[PDB]
């Protein structure tokens, strides 16, 4: 019955309605039921038949549309497409004119940006890069870092050589002696 159709699973709801209507009419004929009940059952069958045919053509339209769509995509971004999105993105960020957006962008321009932004752990983990003593002073507020509108508690601080660094020890007189930039490992105060 549904052996020639493309998808018997897709065709099933409309086919059952038609088959059930066809079966009622066949039982009505065999049981020689009233001409009135026969006229009702014939109409129900005509309705279900035309619904089955309507859904069958809709299915053919959707399959053809997808077949054509797949045939045209198969053709397949640009440094240009990425460049167009970069232009849009930075243009919109400036147009927003929000101090926290301006802060994050100015920090990145001066090398204050994340090395890593690791989620989950029920507490987001940020490794921030601080290229000098002045910029480090702006972001670090004691045992906390103020970045991306949030406050992060300091876990660890490292040299550009990966060596452990004590923040108390990073001072004006020491700046020449420290291998910059510093990596501040911190966790979101959540």
């Amino acid at each position: 019955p549904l052996g020639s159709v493309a998808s018997a699973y897709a065709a099933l709801p409309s086919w059952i309605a038609y088959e059930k209507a066809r079966a009622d009419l066949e039982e009505a004929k065999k049981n020689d039921v009233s001409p009135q009940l026969l006229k009702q059952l014939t109409k129900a069958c005509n309705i279900a038949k035309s619904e089955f045919e309507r859904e069958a053509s809709v299915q053919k339209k959707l399959d053809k549309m997808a077949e054509q769509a797949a045939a045209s995509m198969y053709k397949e971004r640009k440094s240009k497409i990425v460049s167009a999105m970069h232009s849009l993105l930075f243009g919109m960020l400036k147009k927003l004119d929000m101090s926290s957006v301006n802060t994050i962008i100015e920090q990145a321009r001066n090398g204050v940006l994340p090395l890593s932004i690791i989620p989950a752990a029920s507490a987001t983990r940020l490794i921030v890069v601080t290229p000098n003593l002045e910029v480090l002073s702006k972001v670090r507020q004691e045992n906390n870092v103020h970045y991306a509108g949030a406050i992060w508690s300091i876990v660890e601080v490292k040299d550009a050589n990966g060596a452990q660094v004590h923040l108390k020890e990073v001072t004006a007189a020491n700046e020449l002696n420290i291998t910059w930039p510093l990596s501040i490992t911190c966790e979101r105060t959540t």
Partner: protein, 82 residues
């Protein structure tokens, strides 16, 4: 505040950019990105949207060489043609 759709449209461009940066290779990182983007689009509190947008921008910022990023900001943010 009134710039809620502006922040939501920025978020869409960010996710599009992140997708082109092959973050998909890292499932944990990808779900964090997609998560933030989807949450932004379903949120009507501007304060909460900005917080999440700031998290997405930061993630985006991390996926760049410091040197190229400075040039990108100078070109497209500092000297925008919009």
């Amino acid at each position: 505040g009134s710039k809620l759709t502006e922040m939501k449209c920025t978020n869409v461009v960010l996710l599009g950019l992140l997708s082109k940066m092959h973050v998909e290779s890292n499932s944990k990182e990808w779900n964090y990105c997609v998560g933030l983007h989807n949450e932004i689009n379903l949120c009507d509190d501007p304060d909460a949207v900005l917080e999440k947008l700031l998290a997405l921008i930061a993630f985006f910022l991390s996926k760049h060489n410091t040197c190229d990023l400075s040039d990108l900001i100078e070109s497209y943010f500092e000297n925008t043609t919009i």
